[PDB]
A paper describes a structure:
We recently isolated two mAbs from an HIV-1 infected donor (CAP228) that bind to V2 peptides, confirming that V2p epitopes are in fact presented during HIV-1 infection (van Eeden, C., Wibmer, C. K. et al., manuscript submitted). Here, we first determined the cocrystal structures of these new antibodies bound to V2 peptides, identifying a common class of V2p mAbs that share a conserved α-helix-coil epitope with the RV144 mAb CH58. The α4β7 integrin binds to a highly-conserved tripeptide motif in the V2 region of gp120 (at positions 179–181) that mimics a binding loop in its natural ligands.
A structure of the first mAb, CAP228-16H, bound to a scaffolded V1V2 domain from a heterologous strain CAP225 was solved at 2.3 Å resolution, while a structure of the second mAb CAP228-3D, in complex with a V2 peptide (gp120 residues 164–182) from heterologous virus strain CAP45 was solved at 2.6 Å resolution. The crystal lattice formed from CAP228-16H bound to 1FD6-V1V2 was constructed predominantly by Fab-Fab interactions. As a result, only the V2p epitope in direct contact with the antibody was ordered, and the V1V2 scaffold could not be resolved. The additionally resolved N- and C-terminal regions of V1V2 loosely encircled the CDR-H3 of CAP228-16H before inserting into the scaffold. Presumably this was also the case for the partially resolved cocrystal structure of CAP228-16H bound to the CAP225 V1V2 described above, however the heterologous strain has significantly longer V1 and hypervariable V2 loops, which would have introduced more flexibility and possibly contributed to the disorder of the heterologous complex. Similarly, both CAP228-16H and CH58 acquired an arginine substitution in the CDR-H1 at position 28 that formed a key salt bridge interaction with the α4β7 binding tripeptide motif of gp120 (marked in green). Packing interactions in the CAP225-V1V2 crystal lattice displace the R28 side chain, but an R97 residue in the CAP228-16H CDR-H3 compensates for this by forming a salt bridge with an alternate rotamer of D180. In addition to this mechanism of maturation, the presence of R97 in the CDR-H3 of CAP228-16H may have also contributed to D180 binding in the context of the initial CAP228 B cell activation event. In contrast, the CAP228 antibodies recognise more diverse immunotypes at this position, including the most globally prevalent Y173 immunotype present in the CAP45 and CAP228 strains, as well as the rarer H173 or R173 immunotypes found in the 92TH023 or CAP225 strains, respectively.
Residue numbers in the entry:
A (entry chain L): 2 to 9, 11 to 95, 95A, 96 to 106, 106A, 107 to 209
B (entry chain H): 1 to 52, 52A, 53 to 82, 82A, 82B, 82C, 83 to 100, 100A, ...
C (entry chain P): 164 to 185
Write the structure that this text describes.
Protein backbone atom coordinates (compact mmCIF):
# COMPACT_ATOMS: atom_id res chain seq x y z
CA UNK A 1 0.00 0.00 0.00
CA UNK A 2 1.23 3.49 -0.89
CA UNK A 3 0.31 7.04 0.11
CA UNK A 4 0.92 9.60 -2.66
CA UNK A 5 1.80 13.19 -1.78
CA UNK A 6 2.99 16.02 -4.05
CA UNK A 7 6.73 16.51 -3.44
CA UNK A 8 6.41 20.30 -3.23
CA UNK A 9 3.65 22.91 -2.89
CA UNK A 10 4.05 26.69 -2.91
CA UNK A 11 1.35 29.21 -1.99
CA UNK A 12 1.10 32.94 -1.38
CA UNK A 13 0.74 33.99 2.28
CA UNK A 14 -2.84 34.52 3.41
CA UNK A 15 -4.29 32.14 0.83
CA UNK A 16 -5.47 28.58 1.49
CA UNK A 17 -2.83 25.85 1.28
CA UNK A 18 -4.01 22.41 0.16
CA UNK A 19 -1.91 19.24 0.51
CA UNK A 20 -3.36 15.98 -0.81
CA UNK A 21 -2.66 12.37 0.22
CA UNK A 22 -3.31 9.71 -2.40
CA UNK A 23 -4.37 6.21 -1.44
CA UNK A 24 -6.73 3.49 -2.60
CA UNK A 25 -9.94 3.63 -0.55
CA UNK A 26 -8.12 5.89 1.92
CA UNK A 27 -11.53 7.32 2.81
CA UNK A 28 -12.33 4.04 4.58
CA UNK A 29 -9.55 4.58 7.15
CA UNK A 30 -8.28 7.41 9.37
CA UNK A 31 -5.57 9.78 8.12
CA UNK A 32 -3.20 11.76 10.34
CA UNK A 33 -0.99 14.72 9.41
CA UNK A 34 2.39 15.68 10.87
CA UNK A 35 4.44 18.86 10.49
CA UNK A 36 8.25 18.83 10.47
CA UNK A 37 10.51 21.85 10.36
CA UNK A 38 14.16 21.46 9.30
CA UNK A 39 16.22 20.08 12.17
CA UNK A 40 13.19 19.33 14.37
CA UNK A 41 11.07 16.31 15.20
CA UNK A 42 7.66 15.81 13.56
CA UNK A 43 4.62 17.43 15.15
CA UNK A 44 1.07 16.08 15.00
CA UNK A 45 -1.21 18.72 13.49
CA UNK A 46 -4.27 16.66 12.47
CA UNK A 47 -5.56 13.27 13.60
CA UNK A 48 -8.65 11.20 12.80
CA UNK A 49 -9.07 13.16 9.54
CA UNK A 50 -10.48 16.39 11.00
CA UNK A 51 -9.33 16.65 14.65
CA UNK A 52 -6.77 19.17 15.93
CA UNK A 53 -4.55 18.44 18.94
CA UNK A 54 -4.35 21.09 21.63
CA UNK A 55 -2.01 23.94 20.73
CA UNK A 56 -2.65 23.68 16.97
CA UNK A 57 -4.33 26.82 15.56
CA UNK A 58 -7.81 26.51 14.10
CA UNK A 59 -6.70 27.49 10.58
CA UNK A 60 -5.48 23.89 10.22
CA UNK A 61 -8.22 21.50 9.09
CA UNK A 62 -8.56 18.19 7.30
CA UNK A 63 -10.90 16.01 5.30
CA UNK A 64 -10.86 12.49 3.87
CA UNK A 65 -13.10 10.64 1.42
CA UNK A 66 -13.08 8.36 -1.59
CA UNK A 67 -9.46 7.98 -2.68
CA UNK A 68 -8.09 11.26 -1.33
CA UNK A 69 -7.44 12.96 1.99
CA UNK A 70 -6.63 16.65 2.32
CA UNK A 71 -4.82 18.90 4.76
CA UNK A 72 -5.99 22.51 4.53
CA UNK A 73 -4.26 25.53 6.04
CA UNK A 74 -6.38 28.66 5.81
CA UNK A 75 -4.77 32.11 5.89
CA UNK A 76 -1.43 30.34 5.56
CA UNK A 77 1.43 32.16 7.28
CA UNK A 78 5.20 32.16 6.90
CA UNK A 79 5.46 30.12 10.10
CA UNK A 80 3.62 27.24 8.41
CA UNK A 81 6.46 26.68 5.91
CA UNK A 82 7.60 23.10 6.50
CA UNK A 83 7.38 19.45 5.46
CA UNK A 84 4.05 17.68 5.91
CA UNK A 85 3.42 13.94 6.10
CA UNK A 86 0.20 11.94 5.97
CA UNK A 87 0.02 8.64 7.82
CA UNK A 88 -2.37 5.71 8.18
CA UNK A 89 -2.56 2.39 10.00
CA UNK A 90 -3.45 0.15 7.08
CA UNK A 91 -3.29 -3.37 8.53
CA UNK A 92 -2.16 -5.12 11.71
CA UNK A 93 1.58 -4.83 11.00
CA UNK A 94 1.42 -2.03 8.39
CA UNK A 95 1.87 1.62 9.41
CA UNK A 96 2.43 3.84 6.39
CA UNK A 97 3.65 7.41 5.94
CA UNK A 98 3.28 9.41 2.77
CA UNK A 99 6.35 10.59 0.91
CA UNK A 100 6.05 14.07 2.37
CA UNK A 101 5.32 17.50 0.91
CA UNK A 102 7.52 20.59 1.22
CA UNK A 103 5.19 23.56 1.73
CA UNK A 104 6.82 26.87 0.81
CA UNK A 105 5.04 30.11 1.69
CA UNK A 106 6.23 32.45 -1.05
CA UNK A 107 8.22 35.33 0.44
CA UNK A 108 9.78 36.38 -2.89
CA UNK A 109 9.28 35.78 -6.63
CA UNK A 110 10.31 32.52 -8.25
CA UNK A 111 13.96 32.38 -9.32
CA UNK A 112 15.51 29.92 -11.76
CA UNK A 113 18.75 28.19 -10.74
CA UNK A 114 22.21 29.17 -11.90
CA UNK A 115 24.19 26.02 -12.71
CA UNK A 116 27.96 25.59 -12.92
CA UNK A 117 29.49 22.28 -14.05
CA UNK A 118 33.16 21.74 -13.09
CA UNK A 119 35.07 18.88 -14.74
CA UNK A 120 37.65 16.88 -12.77
CA UNK A 121 40.73 18.93 -12.01
CA UNK A 122 44.08 17.62 -13.21
CA UNK A 123 45.24 17.11 -9.62
CA UNK A 124 42.31 14.82 -8.82
CA UNK A 125 43.12 12.80 -11.95
CA UNK A 126 46.67 12.53 -10.58
CA UNK A 127 45.07 10.86 -7.54
CA UNK A 128 43.37 8.35 -9.89
CA UNK A 129 39.89 9.76 -9.25
CA UNK A 130 37.49 11.80 -11.38
CA UNK A 131 34.61 13.85 -9.98
CA UNK A 132 32.28 16.07 -11.98
CA UNK A 133 30.84 18.75 -9.68
CA UNK A 134 27.50 20.43 -10.45
CA UNK A 135 26.81 23.46 -8.24
CA UNK A 136 23.31 24.97 -8.30
CA UNK A 137 22.57 28.33 -6.71
CA UNK A 138 20.05 31.15 -6.37
CA UNK A 139 16.81 29.24 -6.96
CA UNK A 140 13.46 29.63 -5.20
CA UNK A 141 11.40 27.75 -4.03
CA UNK A 142 13.97 25.27 -2.71
CA UNK A 143 12.94 22.21 -4.73
CA UNK A 144 14.91 20.92 -7.72
CA UNK A 145 15.56 17.60 -9.43
CA UNK A 146 19.03 16.78 -10.77
CA UNK A 147 19.77 14.39 -13.64
CA UNK A 148 23.11 13.35 -15.13
CA UNK A 149 23.73 12.39 -18.76
CA UNK A 150 26.74 10.61 -20.24
CA UNK A 151 26.63 11.71 -23.87
CA UNK A 152 22.83 11.41 -24.10
CA UNK A 153 22.09 8.50 -21.74
CA UNK A 154 20.94 9.02 -18.13
CA UNK A 155 23.29 7.69 -15.47
CA UNK A 156 22.36 6.87 -11.87
CA UNK A 157 25.47 4.99 -10.70
CA UNK A 158 28.00 7.20 -8.95
CA UNK A 159 25.64 10.14 -8.34
CA UNK A 160 25.41 11.91 -4.97
CA UNK A 161 23.13 14.92 -4.43
CA UNK A 162 22.64 17.17 -1.41
CA UNK A 163 19.30 18.53 -0.20
CA UNK A 164 18.79 22.23 -1.02
CA UNK A 165 19.94 24.62 1.71
CA UNK A 166 19.25 28.30 2.30
CA UNK A 167 21.78 30.84 1.06
CA UNK A 168 22.42 34.15 2.82
CA UNK A 169 19.86 35.88 0.57
CA UNK A 170 17.13 33.33 1.53
CA UNK A 171 17.41 31.65 -1.88
CA UNK A 172 18.49 28.01 -2.13
CA UNK A 173 21.57 26.12 -3.27
CA UNK A 174 22.35 22.47 -3.95
CA UNK A 175 25.19 20.33 -5.25
CA UNK A 176 25.54 17.09 -7.19
CA UNK A 177 28.56 14.86 -7.77
CA UNK A 178 29.26 12.30 -10.49
CA UNK A 179 32.11 9.92 -9.65
CA UNK A 180 34.06 8.42 -12.56
CA UNK A 181 37.34 6.65 -13.10
CA UNK A 182 39.81 8.69 -15.19
CA UNK A 183 39.35 6.10 -17.95
CA UNK A 184 35.57 6.58 -17.94
CA UNK A 185 36.03 10.36 -17.89
CA UNK A 186 38.32 10.25 -20.93
CA UNK A 187 36.28 7.66 -22.86
CA UNK A 188 33.11 9.76 -23.34
CA UNK A 189 32.34 12.69 -25.62
CA UNK A 190 30.50 14.82 -23.06
CA UNK A 191 28.74 14.89 -19.70
CA UNK A 192 25.70 16.94 -18.73
CA UNK A 193 24.10 18.15 -15.50
CA UNK A 194 20.39 18.98 -15.87
CA UNK A 195 18.51 20.81 -13.11
CA UNK A 196 14.71 20.91 -13.31
CA UNK A 197 12.91 23.60 -11.31
CA UNK A 198 9.28 24.73 -11.54
CA UNK A 199 8.82 23.06 -14.92
CA UNK A 200 11.95 24.55 -16.55
CA UNK A 201 15.27 22.77 -17.10
CA UNK A 202 18.77 24.28 -17.10
CA UNK A 203 21.53 22.16 -18.65
CA UNK A 204 25.32 22.42 -18.52
CA UNK A 205 27.83 20.28 -20.42
CA UNK A 206 31.55 19.55 -20.19
CA UNK A 207 33.87 17.52 -22.42
CA UNK A 208 37.22 15.84 -21.68
CA UNK A 209 38.92 17.79 -24.48
CA UNK B 1 4.83 17.39 30.72
CA UNK B 2 4.64 14.27 28.58
CA UNK B 3 7.93 13.78 26.78
CA UNK B 4 10.24 11.26 25.17
CA UNK B 5 14.00 11.78 25.53
CA UNK B 6 16.26 9.79 23.22
CA UNK B 7 19.90 8.78 23.63
CA UNK B 8 22.81 10.65 22.08
CA UNK B 9 24.23 10.51 18.57
CA UNK B 10 26.18 7.40 17.59
CA UNK B 11 29.07 6.71 15.21
CA UNK B 12 29.62 2.99 14.61
CA UNK B 13 31.28 0.66 12.11
CA UNK B 14 29.61 -1.91 9.83
CA UNK B 15 29.02 -5.25 11.51
CA UNK B 16 28.84 -3.79 15.03
CA UNK B 17 25.79 -3.97 17.28
CA UNK B 18 23.97 -0.92 18.59
CA UNK B 19 21.22 -0.12 21.08
CA UNK B 20 19.48 3.26 21.18
CA UNK B 21 16.93 4.19 23.82
CA UNK B 22 13.83 6.32 24.36
CA UNK B 23 12.90 7.39 27.90
CA UNK B 24 9.26 8.31 28.51
CA UNK B 25 8.19 10.64 31.29
CA UNK B 26 5.00 12.37 32.41
CA UNK B 27 2.62 9.54 31.49
CA UNK B 28 1.87 5.88 32.15
CA UNK B 29 4.44 4.07 30.02
CA UNK B 30 2.63 0.68 29.82
CA UNK B 31 -0.56 2.03 28.19
CA UNK B 32 0.79 3.52 24.94
CA UNK B 33 2.48 2.00 21.92
CA UNK B 34 6.01 3.18 21.17
CA UNK B 35 6.91 3.26 17.48
CA UNK B 36 10.29 3.71 15.81
CA UNK B 37 10.63 5.74 12.61
CA UNK B 38 13.67 6.13 10.35
CA UNK B 39 14.50 9.27 8.37
CA UNK B 40 17.55 9.37 6.12
CA UNK B 41 18.68 13.03 6.06
CA UNK B 42 16.77 14.88 3.36
CA UNK B 43 14.36 11.96 2.85
CA UNK B 44 10.95 11.06 4.27
CA UNK B 45 9.70 9.11 7.27
CA UNK B 46 9.83 5.30 7.29
CA UNK B 47 8.06 3.22 9.93
CA UNK B 48 10.21 0.40 11.33
CA UNK B 49 8.25 -1.21 14.16
CA UNK B 50 6.17 -0.68 17.26
CA UNK B 51 5.95 -2.19 20.74
CA UNK B 52 3.25 -2.14 23.40
CA UNK B 53 5.21 -1.95 26.69
CA UNK B 54 2.29 -3.33 28.69
CA UNK B 55 3.11 -6.86 27.53
CA UNK B 56 5.85 -6.59 24.90
CA UNK B 57 3.79 -7.17 21.76
CA UNK B 58 5.89 -6.11 18.78
CA UNK B 59 5.03 -5.51 15.13
CA UNK B 60 7.56 -4.83 12.39
CA UNK B 61 7.66 -3.63 8.82
CA UNK B 62 8.47 -6.71 6.75
CA UNK B 63 11.74 -5.29 5.40
CA UNK B 64 13.04 -4.50 8.91
CA UNK B 65 12.18 -7.90 10.38
CA UNK B 66 15.39 -9.76 11.18
CA UNK B 67 17.55 -6.61 11.18
CA UNK B 68 16.29 -4.84 14.32
CA UNK B 69 14.75 -5.81 17.64
CA UNK B 70 12.50 -3.58 19.75
CA UNK B 71 12.26 -4.06 23.51
CA UNK B 72 11.00 -2.20 26.56
CA UNK B 73 11.89 -1.79 30.24
CA UNK B 74 8.84 -1.35 32.48
CA UNK B 75 10.85 -0.18 35.51
CA UNK B 76 12.84 2.59 33.79
CA UNK B 77 10.06 3.35 31.28
CA UNK B 78 12.53 2.96 28.43
CA UNK B 79 12.07 1.59 24.92
CA UNK B 80 15.02 0.25 22.93
CA UNK B 81 15.85 -0.25 19.26
CA UNK B 82 18.69 -2.70 18.69
CA UNK B 83 20.82 -3.81 15.73
CA UNK B 84 22.82 -7.03 15.87
CA UNK B 85 24.89 -6.19 12.75
CA UNK B 86 24.87 -2.62 11.44
CA UNK B 87 25.18 -1.77 7.75
CA UNK B 88 26.29 1.44 6.07
CA UNK B 89 22.71 1.93 4.83
CA UNK B 90 21.57 2.23 8.47
CA UNK B 91 22.89 5.80 8.63
CA UNK B 92 19.86 7.93 9.49
CA UNK B 93 17.96 9.85 12.14
CA UNK B 94 15.80 7.62 14.34
CA UNK B 95 12.71 8.86 16.18
CA UNK B 96 10.54 7.25 18.82
CA UNK B 97 6.89 8.25 19.06
CA UNK B 98 3.97 7.51 21.38
CA UNK B 99 0.72 6.15 19.93
CA UNK B 100 -2.64 5.65 21.62
CA UNK B 101 -3.94 2.20 22.50
CA UNK B 102 -7.19 2.45 20.53
CA UNK B 103 -9.67 4.10 22.91
CA UNK B 104 -11.52 7.38 22.48
CA UNK B 105 -9.92 8.97 25.56
CA UNK B 106 -6.50 9.14 23.84
CA UNK B 107 -5.15 10.37 20.51
CA UNK B 108 -4.83 7.38 18.16
CA UNK B 109 -1.80 8.83 16.40
CA UNK B 110 1.84 9.66 17.03
CA UNK B 111 1.05 12.59 19.31
CA UNK B 112 4.41 12.81 21.13
CA UNK B 113 7.79 12.43 19.41
CA UNK B 114 11.33 12.12 20.68
CA UNK B 115 13.97 14.61 19.59
CA UNK B 116 15.75 12.06 17.37
CA UNK B 117 19.01 10.10 17.53
CA UNK B 118 21.46 10.42 14.64
CA UNK B 119 23.25 7.17 13.78
CA UNK B 120 26.21 7.20 11.38
CA UNK B 121 27.68 3.89 10.20
CA UNK B 122 31.10 4.04 8.54
CA UNK B 123 34.15 1.78 8.44
CA UNK B 124 36.38 4.87 8.55
CA UNK B 125 38.36 6.51 11.34
CA UNK B 126 39.73 10.04 11.66
CA UNK B 127 41.11 11.25 8.33
CA UNK B 128 42.01 14.69 7.00
CA UNK B 129 40.59 16.05 3.74
CA UNK B 130 42.13 16.39 0.31
CA UNK B 131 41.44 19.83 -1.17
CA UNK B 132 41.17 20.14 -4.95
CA UNK B 133 40.55 23.34 -6.94
CA UNK B 134 37.41 23.98 -8.98
CA UNK B 135 38.97 26.45 -11.40
CA UNK B 136 36.98 29.12 -13.27
CA UNK B 137 37.04 29.35 -17.05
CA UNK B 138 30.17 39.09 -16.29
CA UNK B 139 30.79 36.88 -13.25
CA UNK B 140 32.57 33.56 -12.80
CA UNK B 141 32.13 30.78 -10.25
CA UNK B 142 35.17 29.17 -8.63
CA UNK B 143 35.52 26.91 -5.65
CA UNK B 144 37.25 24.05 -3.94
CA UNK B 145 36.27 20.44 -3.35
CA UNK B 146 37.05 19.04 0.12
CA UNK B 147 37.15 15.28 -0.33
CA UNK B 148 37.42 12.06 1.67
CA UNK B 149 37.51 13.27 5.27
CA UNK B 150 36.10 11.85 8.49
CA UNK B 151 34.40 12.72 10.81
CA UNK B 152 32.39 15.91 10.40
CA UNK B 153 32.74 18.89 10.37
CA UNK B 154 35.05 20.94 8.15
CA UNK B 155 34.89 24.72 8.03
CA UNK B 156 35.69 26.65 4.85
CA UNK B 157 36.50 30.33 4.42
CA UNK B 158 37.89 32.38 1.54
CA UNK B 159 40.92 34.67 1.76
CA UNK B 160 40.83 34.22 5.54
CA UNK B 161 37.34 35.68 5.81
CA UNK B 162 38.08 38.71 3.62
CA UNK B 163 35.99 37.27 0.75
CA UNK B 164 32.43 36.71 1.97
CA UNK B 165 30.04 37.91 -0.77
CA UNK B 166 28.84 35.22 -3.16
CA UNK B 167 30.25 32.46 -0.92
CA UNK B 168 28.32 29.28 -0.18
CA UNK B 169 29.57 26.13 1.55
CA UNK B 170 27.38 23.12 0.83
CA UNK B 171 26.48 20.34 3.28
CA UNK B 172 28.62 17.23 3.15
CA UNK B 173 27.71 13.96 1.44
CA UNK B 174 28.58 10.59 2.99
CA UNK B 175 30.09 8.42 0.27
CA UNK B 176 29.84 4.64 0.03
CA UNK B 177 33.48 4.63 1.20
CA UNK B 178 32.38 5.89 4.62
CA UNK B 179 34.04 9.28 4.09
CA UNK B 180 32.60 12.78 3.70
CA UNK B 181 32.96 15.22 0.82
CA UNK B 182 31.70 18.76 0.32
CA UNK B 183 32.27 21.80 -1.88
CA UNK B 184 32.62 25.53 -1.35
CA UNK B 185 31.87 28.02 -4.13
CA UNK B 186 32.19 31.77 -4.68
CA UNK B 187 31.06 34.05 -7.51
CA UNK B 188 33.47 36.84 -8.43
CA UNK B 189 33.88 39.45 -11.17
CA UNK B 190 35.44 37.77 -14.20
CA UNK B 191 37.72 40.80 -14.70
CA UNK B 192 39.47 40.29 -11.34
CA UNK B 193 40.49 36.71 -12.21
CA UNK B 194 43.79 37.88 -13.70
CA UNK B 195 44.88 40.06 -10.77
CA UNK B 196 43.05 38.98 -7.62
CA UNK B 197 44.17 35.83 -5.79
CA UNK B 198 41.52 33.52 -4.31
CA UNK B 199 42.45 31.06 -1.56
CA UNK B 200 40.05 28.74 0.25
CA UNK B 201 40.99 27.83 3.82
CA UNK B 202 39.75 24.41 4.95
CA UNK B 203 39.90 23.51 8.64
CA UNK B 204 39.31 19.98 9.98
CA UNK B 205 39.86 20.04 13.75
CA UNK B 206 39.18 16.31 14.36
CA UNK B 207 42.36 15.54 12.38
CA UNK B 208 44.05 18.84 13.34
CA UNK B 209 44.48 19.80 9.68
CA UNK B 210 44.43 23.19 7.97
CA UNK B 211 44.76 23.52 4.19
CA UNK B 212 45.10 26.71 2.15
CA UNK B 213 44.41 26.15 -1.55
CA UNK B 214 44.77 28.92 -4.12
CA UNK B 215 42.29 28.44 -6.97
CA UNK B 216 43.45 29.80 -10.33
CA UNK B 217 42.05 29.83 -13.86
CA UNK B 218 43.43 27.17 -16.18
CA UNK B 219 44.85 27.74 -19.65
CA UNK C 1 -20.49 6.71 10.00
CA UNK C 2 -17.33 8.29 11.41
CA UNK C 3 -17.91 6.25 14.58
CA UNK C 4 -18.12 3.03 12.55
CA UNK C 5 -14.86 3.85 10.75
CA UNK C 6 -13.20 4.76 14.06
CA UNK C 7 -14.14 1.41 15.60
CA UNK C 8 -12.99 -0.46 12.49
CA UNK C 9 -9.62 1.32 12.46
CA UNK C 10 -8.97 1.20 16.21
CA UNK C 11 -9.62 -2.56 16.26
CA UNK C 12 -6.27 -2.98 14.46
CA UNK C 13 -4.17 -1.72 17.39
CA UNK C 14 -6.53 -1.88 20.38
CA UNK C 15 -4.83 -2.98 23.60
CA UNK C 16 -6.54 -3.29 26.98
CA UNK C 17 -4.86 -1.85 30.08
CA UNK C 18 -6.46 -4.49 32.36
CA UNK C 19 -4.40 -7.59 33.16
CA UNK C 20 -5.03 -10.45 32.96
CA UNK C 21 -7.33 -10.44 29.93
CA UNK C 22 -10.88 -11.35 30.96
Amino acid sequence: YELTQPPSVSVAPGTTATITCGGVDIGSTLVHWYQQRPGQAPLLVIYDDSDRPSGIPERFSGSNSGNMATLTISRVEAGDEADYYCQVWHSTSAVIFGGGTKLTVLSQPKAAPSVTLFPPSSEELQANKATLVCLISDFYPGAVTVAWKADSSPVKAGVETTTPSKQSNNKYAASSYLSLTPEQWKSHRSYSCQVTHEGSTVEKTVAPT
Amino acid sequence: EVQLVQSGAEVKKPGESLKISCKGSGYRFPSSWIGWVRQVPGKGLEWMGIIYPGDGETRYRASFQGQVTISADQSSNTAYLQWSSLKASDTAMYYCARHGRGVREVINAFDIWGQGTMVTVSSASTKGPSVFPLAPSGTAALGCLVKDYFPEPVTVSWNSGALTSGVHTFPAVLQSSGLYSLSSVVTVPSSSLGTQTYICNVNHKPSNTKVDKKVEPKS
Amino acid sequence: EIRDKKQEVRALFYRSDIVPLK
